[PDB]
Every structure is written in structure tokens, then in C-alpha cells.
Amino acid sequence: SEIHVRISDFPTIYSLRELRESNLSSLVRVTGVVTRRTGVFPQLKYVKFNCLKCGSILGPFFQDSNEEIRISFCTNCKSKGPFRVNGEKTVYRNYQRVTLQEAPGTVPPGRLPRHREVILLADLVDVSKPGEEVEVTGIYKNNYDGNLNAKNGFPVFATIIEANSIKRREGNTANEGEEGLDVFSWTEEEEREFRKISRDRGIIDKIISSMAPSIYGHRDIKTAVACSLFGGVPKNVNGKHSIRGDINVLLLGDPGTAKSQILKYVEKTAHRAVFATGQGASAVGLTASVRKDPITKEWTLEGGALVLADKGVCLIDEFDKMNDQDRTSIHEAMEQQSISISKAGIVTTLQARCSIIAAANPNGGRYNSTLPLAQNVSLTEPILSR
Amino acid sequence: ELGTSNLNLDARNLLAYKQTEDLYHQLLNYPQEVISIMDQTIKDCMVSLIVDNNLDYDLDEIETKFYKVRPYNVGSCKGMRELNPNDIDKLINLKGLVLRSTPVIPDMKVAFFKCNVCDHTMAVEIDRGVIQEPARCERIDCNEPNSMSLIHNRCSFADKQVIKLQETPDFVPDGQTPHSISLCVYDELVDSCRAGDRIEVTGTFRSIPIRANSRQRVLKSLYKTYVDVVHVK
Amino acid sequence: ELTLESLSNVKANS
Amino acid sequence: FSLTVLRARIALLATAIGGPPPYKLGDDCLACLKDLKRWFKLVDDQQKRWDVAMAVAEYRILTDDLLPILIDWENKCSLAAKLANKAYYDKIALNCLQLLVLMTWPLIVTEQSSSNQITLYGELKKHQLVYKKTILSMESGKVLRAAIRLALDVIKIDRLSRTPRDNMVLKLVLNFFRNVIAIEPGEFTINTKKSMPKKGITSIDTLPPNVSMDDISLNTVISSFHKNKVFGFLLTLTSSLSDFINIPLLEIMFYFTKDVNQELLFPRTSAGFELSKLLQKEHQMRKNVIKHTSARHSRFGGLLSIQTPDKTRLTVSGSQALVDEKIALQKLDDSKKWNKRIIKKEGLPNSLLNSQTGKAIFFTESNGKHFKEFINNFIDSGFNILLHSVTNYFTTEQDRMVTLEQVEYLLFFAWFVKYQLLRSKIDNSADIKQVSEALKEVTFILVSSLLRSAYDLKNWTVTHAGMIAFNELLNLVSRTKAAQDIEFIVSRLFSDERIQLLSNLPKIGSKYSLQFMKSCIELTHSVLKVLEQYSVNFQKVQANYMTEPVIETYINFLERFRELEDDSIKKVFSFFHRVFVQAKEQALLFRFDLIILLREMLSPDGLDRMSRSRKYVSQFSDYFLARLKKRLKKSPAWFVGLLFPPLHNSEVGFYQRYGE
Amino acid sequence: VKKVDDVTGEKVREAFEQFLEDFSVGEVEKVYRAQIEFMKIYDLNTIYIDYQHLSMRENGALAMAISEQYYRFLPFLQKGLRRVVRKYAPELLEQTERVFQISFFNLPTVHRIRDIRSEKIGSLLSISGTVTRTSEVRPELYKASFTCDMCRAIVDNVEQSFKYTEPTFCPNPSCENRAFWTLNVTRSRFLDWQKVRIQENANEIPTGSMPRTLDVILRGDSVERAKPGDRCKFTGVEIVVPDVTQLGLPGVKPSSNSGVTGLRSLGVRDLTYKISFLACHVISIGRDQEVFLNSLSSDEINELKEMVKDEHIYDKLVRSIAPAVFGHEAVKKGILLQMLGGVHKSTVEGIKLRGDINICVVGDPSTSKSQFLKYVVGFAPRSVYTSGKASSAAGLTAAVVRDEDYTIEAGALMLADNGICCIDEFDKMDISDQVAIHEAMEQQTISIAKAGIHATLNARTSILAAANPVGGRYNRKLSLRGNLNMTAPIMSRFDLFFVILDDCNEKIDTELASHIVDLHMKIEPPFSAEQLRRYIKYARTFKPILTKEARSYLVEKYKELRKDDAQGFSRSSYRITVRQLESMIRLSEAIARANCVDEITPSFIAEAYDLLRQSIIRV
DNA sequence: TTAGAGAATTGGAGAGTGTGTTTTTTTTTTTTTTT
DNA sequence: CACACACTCTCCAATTCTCTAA
Ligand SMILES: Nc1ncnc2c1ncn2[C@@H]1O[C@H](COP(=O)(O)OP(=O)(O)OP(O)(O)=S)[C@@H](O)[C@H]1O
Ligand SMILES: Nc1ncnc2c1ncn2[C@@H]1O[C@H](COP(=O)(O)OP(=O)(O)O)[C@@H](O)[C@H]1O
Ligand SMILES: [Mg+2]
Ligand SMILES: [Mg+2]
Ligand SMILES: [Zn+2]
Ligand SMILES: [Zn+2]
Ligand SMILES: [Zn+2]
């Protein structure tokens, strides 16, 4: 029935710290990391109340998605009484209230992060997963609430952002200067150009040579990274047997050979990429963790690096320096491509179709060519075979 | 010669003189009225002394200043655990070590209303914590009822500092933990005893009702007790 | 029938 | 649907005239100006809607489009006047200024007015202030310099060579000056169809956010007048009096002086000395306030019982009452929550018709200095000539004058004749002949006839417009008598016909506004002093003044001591002081109202201790108490007769009021 | 409409007017008239009025009038301000009404949290304390403008109290409205509102007593100017904030020490009051070349011109670094090059190239390493000092702490972002701790994926480590690798290694003692610290580039380094990687910045090669 | 003009409709990161 | 649930008013 317009590439980008009263009821482009996300609750679009005293029809008031519709005196009679909606002619729209939080990258070091609630209306729900980093364009409106006025003791209002568009910037933080809500979306001309250049003989060599253009040599590493980036086909025989369809790469070598730089490039290039390093990646943060929800007080399951990188790439720098009991947590998600969690009464099997690219470092810092591979690394066969 | 207000009057000095024995007993029994009349007598005696000795001074300045009396050493060191409820509104001497002290609590003394239709402002004195708001504008040319709105920041406030006194360890029975009582300090002596100090406090042991429900006027029948400090040593 | 130029010359104060 | 179509047409005209960033005249600009003029005229009087003006104010037409037209024409006019299609470039400003004066015309609402006009009056009075706000602040308000061009074009030619048509141009341009400066905030018309709740009106500030009381006061108007040179315009217009330029001009230069007092002219870090004095006074009153508050908190609980007659044990709280028994009795008095009902009551430009004594508009020192000489130059130029010009018109159409004419004329006359006398009193550089020309017999008899005619129609405002002039009549008679037969013909007709009018108003006007009561006390004070140099009899005129309602209306003024000034209390007290030994009629003064006001006077909460008002009053009250004691000691029944009003019986009337 | 006017109020307004317009205060200059012109230039609406200027005029009468009854006099001051600002230039007020904020500062006396008394309510204070918590910048209603639900009449300029006060009556005498209105958010005026929670300073707290806190309200331009931890000197009116729950609100209900009662709007419930400061001004008490030059005064420009045109500027800078340390010219030169840094280039593929220089001053326990670190942390801006002992729970890099959700605790390597992280006792911190900074020292980011939290944090810091050799005293019989517990991956990330030894020389100790005792008795630096800081800031704006011959010389020097570092039968380099080539580039850029030249000559590359070679020939 | 017979209006008690509570986060498991 | 509060709905006799009284 209706077509919405998603404005993209707003010039003036703010942060949840620089918003002021001058921005009220004006388009803003704040940037932050999603923290909470309610379910997609249907919301009243055109409320058509029926008078209880005398009338039976009230005007199709537009719900503003921020404040409750006020009826006050009825039109049929001035007398006031209870009112309720009509189920005959009523239309609903999706409603989700995501809670943006200032990104740890843009938060000043050591300071607490600010946060504003963001309303996602129809067609925008479920577009920003929790924990992802997004750029939200929308109207910066304010509504009055008595709770805040009572708490602060001043006639102070509560602000909220009615999102008009969302672009995710998680896993492509090096992709500034690009245009559009999706850097990886292609136009028809772009698709024709893809089909034209693919027919070229030696396109594979061009693609391989174009992986790390500012990194000399390492054609074997570039080939492996290109193969991992494109990936394979995930088979499923008769619905019973399932074959992994993603390629895992392990870069093992001496220091100063651009192993971490290649990983940073892959993070820049791949669609859904997550970077985790060494000891700074625990077992449950790599795959999945359960937590007691502070508001509803029950156990809920939240994904980690291997879920945020689903159908993408997960980059693990300094693979050999992670704890063994943290490194063994990616055994299932790297072969079966599914995280199985049965903690706190939550028995479920998440899906993580990741493609691990890990950079290691040989024992002693130098790769001893006179010894076999197993004697140069601390990794074992079950993780080396993946 | 120093321009001070408080007086560190001692209780035994009333027994020393002849005609002020009934005065001392009434001070122990009726501390509020006795202290008020003592303060008024102090002010009148000082202005009379200024008049008589011809020591030239601003009479208005002396009259404006509120002069206080601090009767200490009222009696034997009464125990906190032995505060039976017939000591209500009676002068009490207590000894203990202060646990903590709340920040300054402003209590309204003089209200300040404004006529929201003619900008007429008058101050209504507050007695016993009740607001006697004017029924209408004082100005006859306006005399609009219900046109008065309180201007909170233009009122006059006093200083109240509730202090949680604790029974001294050397006097508490060895079995049970020492008890505690709540002090009340007004207009002076505020921050005159930081936490950890040991003091001998003199004040009137008073009890007030507490509202069971904030919205309603229902009052609990337990009458939480405090003491109105008049001197701290 | 206002031109783009009129749009730039606000008439309503707000 | 009709209203939004009207809005559509206004917006269509707004984008048709043109805009900026120099303003550009669009195609058919004259046609759209004529269309707008015709629509506004049709909706103003023919239909009486007052909605087109609203739409114009909404599009900010007067600010965004109309003002830049005159601003852009000003530079062309200056270039053409200094260099040495002029008719087309001249006629364009005529319609713009005609529209401006039409929108700036004051709005009047009466009972005969329909609901639309009263409904939109409150929504358009703020826009009226907006117009004058943006006009005065528009780069020194140069639009008035363009306005005076719409008058100098016609007045340049010979007066005998005037035009039967161009004559209306002068009226139209002149009305703009009086209309812009008469713009004042209105009144919040509370909807009294139902009983108001436990809370009153929240905000009485009838000002839109773009309008501040700083940018709309008469100080801004006077500063704009000085900076726009229009002082010379107002002087030259009056310099060539020797008809249609009299009635508007009567209020063009009167509106900004309709309520401004002449005391602020003379002071009698310069502004900071009065600041220090006011701080001292407020410190004194705050010191008096704290004399009641307890030395300790309210909850100290000072309870007492007053052993009143009959061994009563009435309980009143408060440690303050323990200090003095009078404080305890006052706390007894004000403890009652029951109160009685006190009854109470501008249709013309607000001023003395509705302004209290403290409403002195703040003036810049330089602005005050300029205004001191502006009015003096006007008086030295054409004051009496302008008065004599309208003397002939005032003698005709007595019953054809709307109530606006009296309030806009009598106040002007009285204010300026009072200013001239006070200026002559403070400084001798001004001759009394500069105002002595107002003693003409015909003018005096006509103004007296108007004053007496206003009495029978219950037009109290029009009558108050007359007492303010009647005071200065006696004042000027005294001034021209002391400083000197021309004064006799003006001050001998109040023998028998006028004594009733002057001796009846004080007895009846006590139930009205404060200024109405203030007028009569000044009248009596002046009349008791003008005749003192010739005594038709001193003992006979005072006989009709010593009446109980007269004493009531004099003592009703004393109850406002929180706002009465030194002279206000001085006149009221001197009325009784001058009759203490000269008349010896103190028996009628024995009401408790005067004794309670005396108690308030000598109390520190009333009159100032450092001032020069409470000393002689205190001594005279000391003598008053001696007189009271002497008169009460000789009559036991007079102890309770002091409260009850006097009696009409024959023998007691001389037995009690005169003591045999 | 009859309204009585407090003549004292307009008198104060007029006196403020003359003070603002004709103060004319070391030649005569109308400072406040120029202040209003300054406001017109940039549209800012904060008038910083010094209190001394107000006190000297009017012999202190107006100053006392302000300082005693500020709360009641404020609207009159605003009106007087409007008068002057309109008179000088009406360029104020799609008209957008301008709300002004008079700021008073430099009060004669400064109070404190302990010295709060309720008898100072409605008066100007200068409260000073350490901020511990700041709320969000919420917009508070300032001048509401309601539209009634019927007859569409607009009630405007409704002044707001601490409550949500709304008009009670409609100006149009045909609208029935006593509690029904719809606020016009677009027409209403809002003000920035922040609530900071300050507390008593540490030195002002009596022993044993807990610190006393206060809630200070910040409005307007003074928002976000007081960060937590910073000791600020607030100044403004002190007010008391009632409990708006008791006053009654459209959306909440009263909730359950001495509360008064009896108000018409209250009924049977009581009202309690809380003291809260309302700050009007807060100050803490604890870039192209042309842009920097235009921000510098001409007198400083002269000093900078003398430096840049100098011939021996490089050696003078080296000798002027850490004057209180005797000898150690090489370490001084390395520290100087650290502050200048390199160029933080970013290639086309998105790969970021490091531009920061890392130094490691390894030396005997009696040497002057910590003196160098302390000088750097006390001189270089945005620098922190930390040890390897890992004092705080958060490590050198970052940590997550559960809140009784997860949040990031900033480590030492993050607080020094875009600065220098002076790490001390680099050997003490364990090998299981070294693996954390391998990325933060080369990729300059810290990546954390612990539990429900996942972020790639920024650490663009230069590390100046100071590690004691293994065994306490340096052993020259072994290479630098043997004397240090650091491994090859972390030893190759350090650009410069400086070895300083306390050789048992009878003469050297004499100069050392004479120097230390000489300082304690009173060092003459050719450039003072404040004088050198502006030169470093000016030089940092340079971005030197490599000339054509510079590239060839750099490649040849790198070839020589790798040839001389070859070890093993398979010719496997151990100490010299391509990181050393990038280190030569970084040092060349830093040296060229020292000479304030935009081109890198082969002399600079030769010097950088010498600097690297001297740190690896230690055998 | 005075003491006294007639109209005319509206505030202070009360009928009544709808409110507002009492009402709670301890202690005990389970997880997770550091220690 | 019901007792107490806040407040809309509703209502006669004491308080004000102006025509006919002395
Ligand atoms: N060349 C020097 N010039 C000036 N003072 C020096 C010099 N060498 C040593 N000192 C002094 O020697 C003392 C100790 O030096 P530090 O800088 O504290 O080194 P350090 O921290 O003690 O070394 P360790 O291994 O941590 S114990 C300080 O008071 C220095 O001022
Ligand atoms: N083959 C190469 N081409 C270009 N630069 C390289 C190459 N190998 C290493 N480098 C440089 O070495 C620097 C450090 O690489 P680094 O990310 O530390 O690799 P590793 O983590 O394996 O030691 C990078 O800035 C990179 O530019
Ligand atoms: Mg690496
Ligand atoms: Mg050290
Ligand atoms: Zn209905
Ligand atoms: Zn009033
Ligand atoms: Zn309305």
C-alpha cells in the first residue's frame, strides 16, 4: 500500500554524545553499536475508536509511535468515558525498539558510553542484529514522560530516534568513502560488468593478484585467501548428510611477513567479517553465551564471533596464543558449522557457517624448516585437520 | 565586643541563685518555652545594657541578630537504653559517639507566595510545618483568590542536620549491641561534630508521628523519637 | 505553480 | 473550506509580489497590491471578519515583503533628492503605507461586536505587538523616514493650494504614527463561564516569543523617534498651523506621553545611587520582617495559654507570641480562616485610565535628556497655536464626540499644562505666558460643561478625564496669581452651581478605582489653597467639606500605605491637620478606621523610619491620643459611641459632636 | 492588566545596562561591547562577565545586589542584556528567538560542599569539587507554548517551574479548557540540561568522614564541560529542588526529612526539599601549518621563526630534552624523535601503516630510565605512566567487567590514545601478559570478544618501555636478546633499543654527584619546555616525503642490514625484518620533522640507519 | 434624603462518579571472566 | 472489596441590588 523512502549518505554524521536540543525534529545520522532489541510487536497504525457512551466511530487517528493516542472529549458527546479500539477496520505496522549505544571505537578512552533508544518501524525491523555496529539515519524526536520529570525534578523531556534508514558498519570499518546503504549491493550495470570480466581468460589470476595489492609476494597466501573469500558449495545429501562448504585457512610463518595485514584486508573486503585476537577471545565469546536478562530475569542466549560472522569470515589473529580451553571451542563450528549450547536449561543448536582464517606463529618465533610441521606448532591434529 | 549569639549557660548556675530554682525545674520540665523566654530576656538585657552603659552601637543590628542560649550540664548522664516515654518534651543529657551525619536538610521557615495575576508577593511565616497560604491577594485592587503560587527558591530556609548518635561502648551492656538515636541540629552547630567524634549532647527528647501512607493522612501509632539538640560539648 | 525559487522564499514563518 | 481558500489566496499573493538578496517587484505588483487592499477592506468593515489580516501576519508579509519595499524605496528617494518613472516608483509606496496603517489600526471590541472579532482579538493583539517590534528594530526603524515622505510630498505645496483628494493622504500617513505607538499588550480574557479552580491564571505575559517587553516599551518608540529625525518632522508640522492635521496630531504626539510622568525628567554611577538607596530600604523592610520569625525552627513547638478576661485558657501556638502579648493577640486574630466579600469593578488607549503610580517606564539617561528637550521645543513652537486651532472644533458637535475623543484630548491637555507648570516651578527659565493662553473663557466654559455632562451619564472615565484638568485649572490660577483680573473670570463661577458637583464626587467615588479617589483629594487640596489668599467664605466652603462620607473616602486612601507615597499621605493628613484648629471638627474623626491606620502608621512595618513622614505624623498622633483621652474621659457613653456611627437626633447632634 | 514593578529590579537592570555598555576598562576599551560584537560574529550567546569588573564599578553596590538576590534579579538582568544587545546590533532573534545566558565568573571567594548553608539560597557561589558522574544531555522545557484541544487557540510563553506547569485558562472566551492542552513541540523552546554529581575534594575531607556530594545542574553552553574525575570550579546560583512527585504530575503519583504541608495544590501530602546547585559557568582546575600559525600570538611566532631558521636546531633540541638528566644523548635523541613520530599513512587497499615510534630503554637498575619516562609523561600531551605490575584489574590493554551485562574497562594502552604510553618495569609484566600487546604495538588495535561484547578498540600509542635486564645487571658478554626476557615477535616491534650502563668510573660519578647535588641546590636548557612544546607542535604539521634518491638509499641500507643480520645455514634473518625497513622510514620522517623540512634527504636515512644499527650491534 | 417595604444572584455544604492503595526484589543457582 | 481524597454536579439561604418605600 505504501512505499517508504530510505535516505542514505547524510553528510553531517553525529555521535550519541554530540546530540543537543538544536537537533530536535531534524534528520540525524548517529552511529553506535546495537545493545538491546525487542521483538517485532505489531503496532496500531490507524486507531479507530468506538465511543462507549453514545457513538460508535472515532476518527482514524495516526499513531505517532512515540506517545499514546489521546481521545479526550468525544465528538458525539462532550462527556468523557472509557474508549477502546475497533477490530473491524484496523491496520497494523511492525514495531521494534532497538537501543543504540556509543561504539567502543568512538567512545573517548575511559569514559562511559551514552545511549539512545531507536524506534524501527515497518520494513526496518530485524535489520540490525544485537551487538552489531550500525549507522542510523532518522528523525531525532522527543516525548514527555512523567517518570523522567519526577526522577530529575526538572521539566526535562526524553529523546528518541525514529530510524529512517540503517547501514551496518560492523566488519567494514575500513570502508569509508563509499556510498549507499549497502556497499556490497550491485546495480544492473555492475552485474553486466561482472559477467563481462568473468569471461576473460585468466580472471582467476587477476583476482588472486588483486587480494593484497599493497603486500608484495605471498602468492600462495593470496590464492588461499581468495579461495576462502569465495568459498565452496555447502552440500546436503538427501537432507541427512551435510558437508561443510566453507574453506578454512591457516597462515603460519615468521614475524613481519604480513600475516596480520592480510587478515585486516580480509576483514575490510569480506561481507560479514569478525576480528578476534589471541587471549582476547574467550570460549563463549567466540561461539555463544547465555546470560540472565537484567530486565526480565531469565536465561537468554546471545551469539559470539562465530555467530556475528555467520555466512562470512571469522579472523583469528595469533591463533597459537589462545588458551587451549578457548581454542577447542571452535572445533564444532569449524567442521559441523553449528554451535550446540545446552547450558542453563537452554538446549539449542545455533548455526555458524563461518570460514576461519587464522594467523599462527611457530614455536620459538621462527619456523624451523628442518622439523616437521607438527613439531613447529603447538596445535594438535584435530585442529590442524580442519 | 565579639558580636556572637549563642550563650554557653550552665544549669548549676540556676541552682546557685535563689529565685531561679523553680526556673531550673521548669527548664528541665518545659524546655521549649523556657528557652524561648531565656533568649528573649538575653536580647532585651543586652539592648538595655547598651542603652545604660552608653556604649554606642547600632540598636537595629543587635535587635536583628538572634541570640541563643545553650544550657549544658542539665543533669546526670542519662542512659540511652533508659528513655522511658514520660521524658517526652523534657530536657535530656546524652553521651555517645556519632556514627554518621546527613547533609544539610533545608527546612522552610518563611514562605513566599506570588500573585500570578498582579505580581504581588508577600511572605507568610511557617509555624509547626504548616502552610497558611493566603486565601486571596493582599492587594485590594486585585484581591484575586487562589492566585498565589509558592516560589520555592525565594523562600527562607533554615539548616537541619540529622545525626545518628550511637551508644558509647563503655556504657552499653556487654551482651547486646549498642543502640542508636537520631539527633537534630538547627541553625547552628551544623557540622560541629563530624563522624567518629564523642560528644555530650543536651536536647529535648521529642517524638512525632509518622505517616503510614504518604498519599493519605493515616498516622502510625508508634511515634518515632528524636532529640532537638540545643548544645553539643 | 510556484517555481523552485518560491520554495526558497519561505512565506509561513516556520 | 472558505478559510483555507482565503489562506491560499494570501499565499498566492505572497509569492506573486516577489522577494529577495535584494527584493524584486514581481509582475503585476500594483494589481496584486490593489487586490490585497480590496480584499482587506471588504473583510474589515463590509463583512467584519478580521481574517485576512491574520493570514498576512502569518506569512510574515509585513516583515518579509512590506518593510523591504519601503527600505528599498528609501535609497532611491535619497538618490533622487541628492542628485540635483518617478510617479510609478512613488505610487507603489502609497499602497504599502495604506496597507500598513490599516493593519496597524487599533482593534476595538464591544458588546455589539460579533463573536469572530472578540475571538480573534486575542490572537491578533500579539501580532500587533510583533509589527511594532520588527518595525522599530529594522535597522534603526528607518521606515518612519519613508513615512514622512508620504506627508512632505503633499504639505510641500501651499496650504491654501491644498488638494481635496491629496488631503486624505496626510490623514492616512499621520494615522500610522499614532497607530504604531498605541500598540500595547492586551488582557487575558479568562473564560468565566464556569467557576475557576483552586489555582489562578498561570501566565499573564501576553507576548509572543519574538516579542519581549524590552523591545516594545515606549522607551524603544522614543529612541526610534530620536534616531529617525522625526522630531524635526513633528516640529515642522506644528510650525505651519497657520484642520484635518489637528485631530490625528492631537494623539500622534500624545500616545507616548499619555501616561509618562514628568517626575522622572529631573533626578531632584548616577543610577547606582538610587540603587544603593533602594537596597537600604529593602534591607530595612527585610529586617522588619525577621522580627516576627522565631530564632529557631518552626517545629520548636512554642505553646502558651492567654489568661484572658473570664479566666479563659485559649491556646495559641508560636514562640513569637511568648515575646509580646500583642503578637499573641495578632496570632489570635489571623488564625480565623473565614473572610468576607470585597466588591470590585480600558476601552480606550491604556494610560491614567488604568495605570498605577509605580508604572514609570524605564528610560535611558540619554533618551531622557532628548525627551526633556523635545517636548520643550514643541511647546516653544506650537503648543498654544495647536490648542487654539482645535478650540473652534471643540465648541461644535458636543454630542457628536465619541468617548474616545474626550480621553484622547482631556488627558493630553491636562498632562501638558501640568508639565509646563512643574517645569516653571523647578526652573525659572520658562515664562508662565507659555501656558497662560489656556485661560480663555470659551475653552474653560466648554470643558466645564463637558465635565458636568459626563456626570449624569455615569461615564466615570470621561469624568476622571475632567478632574485631572480641573486640578490644573486651580493650580494655574494660583500660579498666575502669586507670580503676577484675567484669573477672576475663570475662578469665580464656582459659587453655587459648581459647589454641588465638587462636593458630591468624593462622597460617591469611594467605591471605584484608586485614581478616581485620588483626583478628588487633589481637587479639595487645591481649592482649599487657592481661596486662602482672599478669605466666597473660607468658613462656608469648608462647612460642605466636613461630611462623614468625605472622611470615609479620605481614610479609605490611607489603608494602602504599602504603596502610598510621601505626598499622597501628606495631602490626606494635611486635610485633617488644617482643620484641627481652623475648623475644630474632630468629633467626626472618631471612627476606629483612623485609629487602626494610626497604629499601622507608627508601627515599623508601615512608614519608613529613616524617611521624613513618620516623625510629624507620630507627634500629631501623640496629640491625637491626648485629644481622644480628654474627650472620652468626659463621656462614659462615648466609650462605645466611638464605634457606632453618629446619630441624626437633634439634641445629640450638638451634645456629642460639639460638647454643648 | 495592572502589574506592580519592584523599582529595585529596574534600577539593577539599568545599572547592569550602563556596566555592560560603558564599562571601558591596559588602555581604555569597552570589553563588554566587544564581547557583544563577538557574540554577533559567531552567534554564541554566553556573556562571560568577570565579577571583579562588576565589583569595581558602583563601588560594589551592584555586586552585592547581584550576590545576595541573584535568583530574583536574573530576569531583570536578562532584560537589561536584551536592551544592550538590541541597541548595538539587532542581529538577533524563519525568525529564531535567541535566549541569552549571563555567565558570572572570577568570584572573590570560593566555597565548598561542606560550606553549603541554606541561608545562601538564591545567591552566587563558586563551589569547587571533583565530578564523579554526569548524566545525558537531555532537553528541558524552557518556554512552553500550548495549543488547546478545541478552538485551536495558542497559549504561548508559558513559564515552566520544576514541574510540568501548563496554562489553566484559554485566552479565547469560548474555549472550555482547565486540564486539556496539546503542547506545540516545534514552537516551544528547549534548553540543554545536564546533572553532574560532584563531591568534596580529597584534601578538604576531614579524616574518617565520608565525602559530601552535591547535584549541580548545567544548562546551555556549559554542558559536557565537566567530565567525571576532573576537579572543576563551578559558579552560579544555589537553588533548592522540591519533590515534584508530591506536587502532582500527569503521569506519576506521590511515592513514599521534615516535610511541610498545607499548599492548595498539595492537599494532605507534605513537601520535602533538596539543595541542588545550578551552575552558570564551569572551568576545570585539574591541523595545517597555517591553521596552527594563525592560532599563535606574534611574540610566539617570533620565537618559532628563530627556531626554524636556526642552523644547529637539531642538536639544540636533543640537548634540551629532559634537562634534569645528565648524559645519555642517544636516549634524549630517541625520545625527541618519538614525540615527532612518523606519518600515519593508509594505503589504497585500506591497510593502515604504522607511524608511531616505539622505544625501549633497557638499563641497569641505578640508571635514569624512570627519569626519562617521568619527563615524557609530564611533558608530552595525552601521555600516561604505567608499570608492568598491572595495578588495576584492567590490564595494559582492556578488560570486561560484569555489572551487577558487560562493559569495557580502559587499560593503559588506551588512555594514551594518540599519545605516548610510558610503560615502566616492562620486564616485570609476565609473558602471558606480553601476548596482549603484540597487536596493540603493531596493528595499533585491541580486539576483544569475551561475552556479549565484541569490539575492536583503538590504541594509536607510542610505547616508551623501560625494562631491567634479566639478572638485575646488564651482561655485556651476551647479545641484547640474552639480557632481555622479551621474545623475537615483541623485540622486533620496537624501533629503538637503548642500553644504558652504570660503569664503575671514578670520574663519572663525580660529575653525576655534582649534577644531582647542583640541581637540589638550585640545568640550563637551550629551549624551555613551553618554548619547545610549540616547536614540536609546529613540526608535527609537516608530512615529509621521500625523494627519488632517498628511496634508493633506503633500499640499499635495508639490504645491508639484512646481509649483516643473516644467520644460519639457510640464511634466515632473525633480528631484521621488513618492520626494520618501515622503522627506517619512520625515523627518517621523524628526523625530517625535527629539521622542519618537507623532503627526506639521504642524510636523514643514513642517520636513521645509524640509529637502528647502534641498537643491534650490541654483542 | 432616610430607615424599610418590594426584586435578583451565587457560594458553601453535600450528592455522587471515580480513585488508590498492600506489593515485592532478600536469597539461591548458574554463567562467566579473572584470579 | 473501602476508607479517605480530590473534585465534578448540583442547590438554598445569607449576601448584594435597584424599583418602589418614608
Ligand atoms: N644521568 C643522571 N642524571 C640525573 N639523575 C640521574 C642520572 N642517573 C641516575 N639519576 C638519578 O638516580 C635516581 C634513580 O634513577 P631512576 O630514574 O629512578 O631509575 P630507576 O627507576 O631507579 O631504575 P630501576 O631499575 O627502576 S630501580 C633518580 O633520583 C635519578 O634522578
Ligand atoms: N610482502 C610484504 N609486502 C609489503 N609489506 C610487507 C610484506 N611483509 C610484511 N610487510 C610489512 O610488515 C609490517 C608488519 O607486518 P605484520 O602485520 O606485523 O605481520 P606479522 O603480524 O606476521 O608479523 C606491515 O606494515 C607490512 O606493511
Ligand atoms: Mg601478527
Ligand atoms: Mg623505575
Ligand atoms: Zn460519544
Ligand atoms: Zn493580586
Ligand atoms: Zn481554547
XYZ file of C-alpha atoms in Angstrom, chain E residues 319 321-329 332 366-368 371-372 507-525:
35
model
C 70.350 18.706 24.310
C 65.211 17.136 26.050
C 64.945 16.184 29.739
C 67.455 18.764 31.020
C 67.442 17.255 34.523
C 69.126 14.071 33.204
C 72.901 14.099 32.800
C 74.415 12.490 29.731
C 72.524 9.965 27.610
C 72.442 12.000 24.409
C 67.470 12.027 24.505
C 70.729 2.519 39.108
C 70.369 4.301 35.756
C 67.942 7.084 34.800
C 63.502 9.820 34.939
C 63.113 9.684 31.155
C 85.473 10.323 37.457
C 81.957 9.894 36.017
C 80.461 9.577 39.499
C 81.931 12.986 40.342
C 80.036 14.730 37.544
C 76.898 12.758 38.411
C 77.006 13.759 42.077
C 77.892 17.370 41.276
C 74.955 17.448 38.841
C 72.343 15.905 41.207
C 73.500 17.984 44.205
C 73.689 21.050 41.886
C 70.014 20.584 40.897
C 68.903 20.061 44.519
C 70.818 23.292 45.390
C 69.325 25.486 42.620
C 70.224 22.932 34.448
C 70.239 25.484 31.629
C 68.233 24.229 28.631
